[PDB]
Amino acid sequence: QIDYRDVFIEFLTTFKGNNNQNKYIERINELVAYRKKSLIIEFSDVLSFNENLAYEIINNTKIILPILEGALYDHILQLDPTYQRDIEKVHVRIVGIPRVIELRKIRSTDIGKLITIDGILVKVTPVKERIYKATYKHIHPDCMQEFEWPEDEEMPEVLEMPTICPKCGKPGQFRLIPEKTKLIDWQKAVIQERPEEVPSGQLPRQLEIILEDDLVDSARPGDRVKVTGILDIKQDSPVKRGSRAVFDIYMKVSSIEVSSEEDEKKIKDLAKDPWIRDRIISSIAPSIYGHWELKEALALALFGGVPKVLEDTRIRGDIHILIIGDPGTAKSQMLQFISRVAPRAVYTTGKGSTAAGLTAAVVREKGTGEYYLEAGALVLADGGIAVIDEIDKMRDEDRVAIHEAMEQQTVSIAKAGIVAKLNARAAVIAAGNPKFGRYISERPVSDNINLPPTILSRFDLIFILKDQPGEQDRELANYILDVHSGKSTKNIIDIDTLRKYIAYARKYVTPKITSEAKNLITDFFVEMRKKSSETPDSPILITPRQLEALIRISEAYAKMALKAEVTREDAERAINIMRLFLESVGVDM
Amino acid sequence: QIDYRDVFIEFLTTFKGNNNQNKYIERINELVAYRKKSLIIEFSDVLSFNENLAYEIINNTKIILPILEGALYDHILQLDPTYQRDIEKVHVRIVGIPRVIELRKIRSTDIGKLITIDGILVKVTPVKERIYKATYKHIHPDCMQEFEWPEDEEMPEVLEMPTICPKCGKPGQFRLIPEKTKLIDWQKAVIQERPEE
DNA sequence: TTTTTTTTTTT
Ligand SMILES: [Mg+2]
Ligand SMILES: [Zn+2]
Ligand SMILES: [Zn+2]
């Protein structure tokens, strides 16, 4: 009854934020400056301003939304006439709806209402074009007339062809005219419920969502997203008569969120502590006793180095870690922790993986007999971390796919007439067991791990974990029993804060190596080479590839402390950890 | 509105090249020598010579492109009558269009406009033939009439058969006549975006 | 092509 365009338009112009900044008028600025055509409004903000407007949006969404959009378009038109003849429609998207429903609990009562669903994006289709207003021509020697068939409304999800010519009243043949047809961008994606919500003994459920207009290509597969929109039943084969009055539901997306100022302030405060590096290492797997050297290396892989593009070649910034340990050394517990704290990580197992599943799988569209690719584990981990457990138990045919990923950071696909090269810039963390149960110290690493030597050289660091009973058993027993009793360590950064810290560092920090750091690295290398030249009788090689590892590790240390330069201390720490690896593989100074 | 046919002809004949050599005339003569039927021009030269002509090419390419080809064809046959009886339609192609769009960034607003794309060829089909003007015969014991169904219009990409015989005004059965059907060479290729982008 | 269990030939 009461028009809400009046209260809405002044709400945009008059609203004060946390720091008294008038965000919405600032947000509306680049909408006309950069021609966004889409606006984002928080539900809490509109609720505090006027609850009557807020509750009308949730309930009567299908009616108030077109009215609100028209008011905003007029506001932009008077503010900048140049928007005309450029963008003819502006979308306003509402986020933060309190009505959040689990994927498994959707029932018929929620159809046609604005709801929010949290899940994981698993599938994305290429962008396509959908007709919303067609133009046909009547093929009848008398007629030769053109008209817009879905008059006075929009073309439904099912393409319907006119049967009677509206301009002559006769049936016959109608020809589509693509020149005068109105199109709109259209994309389809599949969302899956999070593994924490799946009930015992059940399999995860999936829901189909539709992204249109500017919402296309707003997310990548494997991302955790929050999506808001309207549910509706799906019609796909109306001509398929015969039983089956049962339909599936699909979601019509109106707004999507992936995964901000106070957090940035909180991150900066943490970096001010001189011992921030020690705190971060102590926060890696707090439930595991000992393994300080391994924890330090795992922290470095989370941050990584800085990739370098030379005149001809490319230098990867990712760090690869290989862990060999006796059974029961808590190898899998840390890998589970790493996959949970990293902003983007994929956890795989040697036995549960295949070559097609790791890189890309060809799917034949039975409906049209068409071939298209599906992203594999390594591709989904691009820009993140790939964790592989029990690498020694993987099939040899499935292991060769990893060889290209670690070396060239690329995956080559040539099958079913599809040729492409895919980026796989991901850090690889692998764990394995020795050949004969426990580890034999006297024998070299190569004959004690059951892996080809060609893959050993591709790892920046290798660690050996030995479960030798001794005087530390009492401390380990006391620590474990405390964990089972609920006792937790203090001064530990929680997972959520730690994940945000890593994401910020990987995005805004690019350390640069100073001259002093370069001299120390060069001096250590040449003196090591001279020492190694006397007797290079070790299974672990000392090739110049180790020099790149030293560069990467030093950059990671600087990035951990949010430093813009690599100083003497960072280079010294990188040498120490590199020296331990060069001597813990069974070869002495 | 303004007939650019005269402007196009003088532009070709009076184009100041790197040394005012009128290279467009040189390639026109080369085209006549080997019967190439395809003339390529640079958008920068057109814009420098007459920016108004350049805008019309880049904006109304659906309408004015056949007009320019007709003007060029008349000039060629006037220059050399022997070009006739060999090529009935010359081709003019534009290069260096400033409107460059990334492949992933294509949206609905770019449909029906002249754009350029950079990529990698992956698949190429063998050369085939496409019908653009078919000839049909009405199989109705009183008709025995032949006609070209797509009257005053090029045959669309969808092969459609007439429903009413235009010559006799009756429905029925129609048979295609390959011997009186116009054909054009047709090939399909697939372009893939570069891995860098 | 792809994963799977099966009998079969052939990589
Ligand atoms: Mg394990
Ligand atoms: Zn009609
Ligand atoms: Zn007839």
mmCIF file of N, CA, C and O and ligand atoms in Angstrom, chain A residues 138 143 165 167-168 170, ligand 2:
data_model
loop_
_atom_site.group_PDB
_atom_site.id
_atom_site.type_symbol
_atom_site.label_atom_id
_atom_site.label_comp_id
_atom_site.label_asym_id
_atom_site.label_seq_id
_atom_site.Cartn_x
_atom_site.Cartn_y
_atom_site.Cartn_z
ATOM 1 N N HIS A 138 6.265 -14.635 -39.614
ATOM 2 C CA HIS A 138 5.328 -15.636 -40.105
ATOM 3 C C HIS A 138 5.661 -15.987 -41.548
ATOM 4 O O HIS A 138 5.661 -15.115 -42.422
ATOM 5 N N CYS A 143 1.615 -13.051 -45.293
ATOM 6 C CA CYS A 143 1.905 -12.304 -44.068
ATOM 7 C C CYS A 143 3.192 -11.486 -44.168
ATOM 8 O O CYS A 143 3.142 -10.255 -44.244
ATOM 9 N N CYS A 165 -0.723 -16.582 -35.849
ATOM 10 C CA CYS A 165 -0.066 -15.309 -36.109
ATOM 11 C C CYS A 165 -0.916 -14.177 -35.549
ATOM 12 O O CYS A 165 -2.067 -14.012 -35.974
ATOM 13 N N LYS A 167 -0.756 -11.086 -36.134
ATOM 14 C CA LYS A 167 -0.966 -10.034 -37.118
ATOM 15 C C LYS A 167 -1.884 -10.450 -38.258
ATOM 16 O O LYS A 167 -2.356 -9.581 -38.997
ATOM 17 N N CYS A 168 -2.146 -11.746 -38.422
ATOM 18 C CA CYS A 168 -3.047 -12.200 -39.474
ATOM 19 C C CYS A 168 -4.050 -13.250 -39.026
ATOM 20 O O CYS A 168 -4.982 -13.533 -39.783
ATOM 21 N N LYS A 170 -3.726 -16.438 -38.785
ATOM 22 C CA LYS A 170 -3.577 -17.737 -39.412
ATOM 23 C C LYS A 170 -2.390 -18.490 -38.822
ATOM 24 O O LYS A 170 -1.389 -17.879 -38.437
HETATM 25 ZN ZN ZN D 2 0.600 -14.054 -40.062
#
